[PDB]
Amino acid sequence: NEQLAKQKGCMACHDLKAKKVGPAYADVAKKYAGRKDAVDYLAGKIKKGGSGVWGSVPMPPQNVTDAEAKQLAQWILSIK
Numbered sequence: 240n241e242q243l244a245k246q247k248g249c250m251a252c253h254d255l256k257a258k259k260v261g262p263a264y265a266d267v268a269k270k271y272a273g274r275k276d277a278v279d280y281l282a283g284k285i286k287k288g289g290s291g292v293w294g295s296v297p298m299p300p301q302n303v304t305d306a307e308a309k310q311l312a313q314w315i316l317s318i319k
């Protein structure tokens with residue numbers, strides 16, 4: 240956990256409690272913490288990228304698979 244975001248380099252904009260170029264993973268988690276499919280949705284935009292729900296900066300695409308996409312929404316959501 241955690242070390243994963245490094246191998247990818249998502250912190251370049253995201254941030255647990257630091258609203259930087261991207262919505263702090265902690266903030267997004269709470270926003271999707273009251274949901275039940277935050278895993279599919281998130282990962283759905285993780286392998287696609289883009290934007291429109293938090294801003295416009297088309298986040299750069301990534302090379303992850305469904306499984307990896309799950310750990311991202313599961314690891315980012317658990318973060319508060």
Ligand code: HEC
Nearest residue numbers: 247248249251252261281284285290291292293294298301
């Ligand atoms: C800055 C260039 C970014 C880097 C690097 C990464 N992400 Fe990102 N991400 C960024 C923004 C600005 C947004 C919001 C765009 C919008 O308006 O919606 C996002 C969003 C995500 C999301 C949300 C998916 C969703 O809710 O549909 C996820 C899951 C996400 N980003 C994952 C992610 C990962 C895994 C990264 C490293 C591989 C990563 N992002 C880098 C900006 C940036």
